[PDB]
Symmetry: C2
Subunit: 155 residues, 2 copies
């Protein structure tokens, strides 16, 4: 791996919103989906695994760096992935909202000395709260996420 | 081709700081350097950028002059680039200083709706301009052919337009 992108999110649940970001990253050697430590962590991990299967994109894997680090800061996460892959160049994938407020992040300056920070457009716009509310309300969520994820959510 | 990164800068003059950003973009199919419009005249900056590209020896980098053609906000520039390469995915590249000032860009939010924005780390131009005016060594600030052109034409120290 030379170019590694790491995309942290609640993935609560993974949605077509996340997919619209992740599918833009085909030029990276490895794209790591790191679920943050309401759906509990083990279920979110299973949902992310289903999501990855559904997307069928060769460069995407789930990462669990927060598990050994466990609050877990972006800095700590990037430091850890850099230690695992010393020869790689690391890119942190962020939402635009956080991109605009990055100066407030713990060790923001230090991050910008070491690593790339990338905001990808959210071409599909879906709030997690809206999906989880749809589940409670009993409405169809098949167009909100990928098929295996939706099957797992209903169960 | 499919992944195109655009890096705008004054390139006034191109430095090892610019190189540190551009060399991180090997994963893009094409990287376009767009010089913007103590400011050296645009055609001279273009000449420096051409030498800089040759010096870096990175096969995916080209100079682009679409700003000259539009004579220009980032928003307008990206719209034009998307027009020229309609099937490409475009990423706009900035360094840390513009990164923390990005909200101030014209239609910054609309940019993020349409295109990827990437802030690359500075691992390594105003220091060069200062060293040239004072006769100090610049060989550690820029690439060899750029240094040659800066000195030979008396850029900054004696002229800004070469006229
Ligand atoms: Cl989420
Ligand atoms: Cl500059």
């Amino acid at each position: 791996m030379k170019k590694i992108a790491i995309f942290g999110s609640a993935f609560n649940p993974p949605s077509l919103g996340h997919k619209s970001v992740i599918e833009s990253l085909s030029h990276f050697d490895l794209v790591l989906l790191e679920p943050s430590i309401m759906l509990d962590y083990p279920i979110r991990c299973k949902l992310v695994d289903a999501f990855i299967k559904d997307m069928g994109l060769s460069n995407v894997q789930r990462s669990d760096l927060e598990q050994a680090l466990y609050s877990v800061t972006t800095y700590a996460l990037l430091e850890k992935i850099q230690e695992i892959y010393p020869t790689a160049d690391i890119t942190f994938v962020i939402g635009p909202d956080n991109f605009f407020k990055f100066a407030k992040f713990y060790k923001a300056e230090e991050i910008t000395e070491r690593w790339t920070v990338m905001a990808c457009p959210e071409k599909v716009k879906i709030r997690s709260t809206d999906i989880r509310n749809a589940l409670i309300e009993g409405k169809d969520i098949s167009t909100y996420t990928t098929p295996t994820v939706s099957e797992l959510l209903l169960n």
